[PDB]
Design a protein around this ligand. Structure first.
Ligand SMILES: [Mg+2]
Length: 182
RNA sequence: GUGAACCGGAUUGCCGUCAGGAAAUUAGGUGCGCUUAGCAGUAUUCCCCACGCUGUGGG
């Protein structure tokens, strides 16, 4: 009960924790290649963290009344590769003069125009709560690790992206007209 | 009992109506198939059996 990582205040729109993961079917999706059922199988803490990190980069439209993320349709992502973590960090180090405030800090604000790097790289288009883990002896449906109490449900609300918001992704690829290249 | 098990690309359709290969052509000029022979007057007729010191009977 306090500050949460990549989360916000609770709501009443209850959804099973499966829409954070694209490959596991949920709601109206057909469960043929992955036999799952909502509120029956859940994810562990590591998978919850890994699914909270997919919001800024891999969020698509929700149909009616729900928009996409900061990058609109998720485009190609091109970067540089190295044989170790330090090398990969050292080959894509280019900083900017304006950094902004990261999302894991205090309550993020859209505020005025311009974004920077830390704010843009951690844009949160949805509010999520991650209620609690429920005791049991099941296994995670994402990694398969035989574990203990998992989470099953959460609350998700939609945050619209204000008009304007001049942003250029360091890794995204754009077209001639400025649209995302997918 | 394997990125594995459970797993249909499915339903509908005439290529029909039109057409002279036609007009004219000697395949012609030369060439012996020829030299030779009794189905008959004999001297062991290819095989087998029986009777004699040639006669019967079968192939
Ligand atoms: Mg997990």
């Amino acid at each position: 009960d306090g500050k949460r990582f990549f989360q916000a205040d609770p709501s009443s729109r209850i959804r099973a924790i499966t829409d954070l993961i694209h490959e596991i079917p949920t709601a109206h999706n057909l469960c043929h290649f992955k036999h799952v059922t909502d509120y029956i199988d859940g994810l562990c803490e590591a998978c919850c963290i890994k699914g909270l990190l997919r919001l800024p980069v891999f969020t698509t439209v929700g149909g009616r009344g729900i928009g996409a993320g900061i990058n609109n349709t998720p485009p190609f992502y091109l970067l540089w590769h190295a044989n170790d973590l330090a090398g990969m960090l050292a080959q894509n180090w280019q900083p900017w003069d304006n950094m902004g405030i990261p999302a894991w800090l205090g309550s993020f604000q859209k505020e005025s125009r311009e974004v920077g790097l830390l704010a843009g790289m951690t844009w949160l288009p949805r509010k999520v709560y991650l209620h609690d883990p429920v005791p049991g002896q099941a296994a995670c449906c994402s990694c398969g690790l035989p574990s203990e109490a998992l989470v099953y449900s959460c609350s998700i609300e939609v945050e619209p992206v204000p008009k304007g918001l001049e942003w250029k992704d360091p890794h995204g690829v754009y077209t001639d007209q400025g649209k995302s290249l997918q």
